[PDB]
Amino acid sequence: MENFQKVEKIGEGTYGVVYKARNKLTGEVVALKKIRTEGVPSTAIREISLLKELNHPNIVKLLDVIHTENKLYLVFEFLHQDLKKFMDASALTGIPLPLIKSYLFQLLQGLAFCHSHRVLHRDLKPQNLLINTEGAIKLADFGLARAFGVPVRTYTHEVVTLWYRAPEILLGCKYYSTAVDIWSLGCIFAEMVTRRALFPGDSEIDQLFRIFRTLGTPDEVVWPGVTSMPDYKPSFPKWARQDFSKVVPPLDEDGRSLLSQMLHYDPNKRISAKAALAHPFFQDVTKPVPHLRL
Numbered sequence: 404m405e406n407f408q409k410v411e412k413i414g415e416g417t418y419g420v421v422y423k424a425r426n427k428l429t430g431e432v433v434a435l436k437k438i439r440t441e442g443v444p445s446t447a448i449r450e451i452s453l454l455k456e457l458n459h460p461n462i463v464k465l466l467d468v469i470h471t472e473n474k475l476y477l478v479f480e481f482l483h484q485d486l487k488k489f490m491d492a493s494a495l496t497g498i499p500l501p502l503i504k505s506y507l508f509q510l511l512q513g514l515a516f517c518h519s520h521r522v523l524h525r526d527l528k529p530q531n532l533l534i535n536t537e538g539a540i541k542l543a544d545f546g547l548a549r550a551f552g553v554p555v556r557t558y559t560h561e562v563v564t565l566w567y568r569a570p571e572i573l574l575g576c577k578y579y580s581t582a583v584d585i586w587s588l589g590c591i592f593a594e595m596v597t598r599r600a601l602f603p604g605d606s607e608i609d610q611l612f613r614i615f616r617t618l619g620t621p622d623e624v625v626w627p628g629v630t631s632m633p634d635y636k637p638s639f640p641k642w643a644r645q646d647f648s649k650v651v652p653p654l655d656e657d658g659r660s661l662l663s664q665m666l667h668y669d670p671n672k673r674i675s676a677k678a679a680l681a682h683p684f685f686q687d688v689t690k691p692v693p694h695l696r697l
């Protein structure tokens with residue numbers, strides 16, 4: 404736009420493109436997300452405009468929403484790096500546990516806030532978590548919900564990452580609960596610790612079976628109602644559960660205990676963000692500053 408002197412492209416989310424841009428008059432640097440559509444509906448702005456009144460230190464601030472010309476531009480405060488890039492940069496040495504703990508704690512604070520205000524993220528992944536030089540981490544790109552996963556991709560031809568998707572979604576549940584966000588965050592937590600994605604599936608069934616191979620194929624005992632799920636098949640292979648000592652070494656018992664509660668199959672048994680903040684794992688939490696190379 405003529406209002407922004409687009410600096411550079413910084414991403415390709417799942418609904419459009421994200422640019423780093425400067426407000427020619429204010430001189431502010433922001434992240435400008437363009438969204439794709441027979442004139443772009445208006446039943447979205449209502450829930451979008453809501454996200455705008457959702458301010459928390461661990462949530463990327465949505466500054467402006469502009470529909471004009473039937474295109475929809477989202478203007479967010481700009482952060483210099485995402486967690487995916489930081490994880491990659493920290494691959495050889497690993498993110499120090501104290502920083503891993505700080506980030507997890509802040510993200511749970513952010514989710515606790517969203518959830519208490521009936522807002523679900525729905526698509527948490529490293530690329531959607533932003534960090535700054537001050538040690539903060541913030542939730543971004545709330546998948547804007549749109550329709551709980553609809554359409555399905557950006558707008559042209561991109562391969563959506565399934566690695567952080569909760570089992571109930573993969574089994575066809577039509578109504579997501581706040582529990583889906585805790586699952587994704589648990590997966591991210593594991594990844595920061597081991598430096599390898601926990602469940603790197605390449606298709607919906609491979610994603611589901613990677614989960615089953617590690618946590619055991621769910622049954623009515625651990626997940627009441629699972630065999631009645633839309634996409635559940637009695638023909639699913641029956642895998643035995645593995646121990647967390649083997650899944651996220653060398654994370655300590657407090658860490659493993661918290662992770663196990665974030666990864667419970669039954670959405671109803673999965674720990675809430677609020678309850679997770681009280682877990683003994685955070686007894687000694689602090690706020691370290693990351694070594695950010697910008």
Ligand SMILES: Nc1nc(Nc2ccccc2)sc1C(=O)c1cccnc1
Nearest residue numbers: 413416434479480481482483484543544
């Ligand atoms: N505010 C913000 N800053 C960002 N900064 C940034 C800096 C360096 C590399 C990549 C992103 S991204 C970003 C976003 O609101 C966002 C993120 C992911 C999908 N859609 C929108």
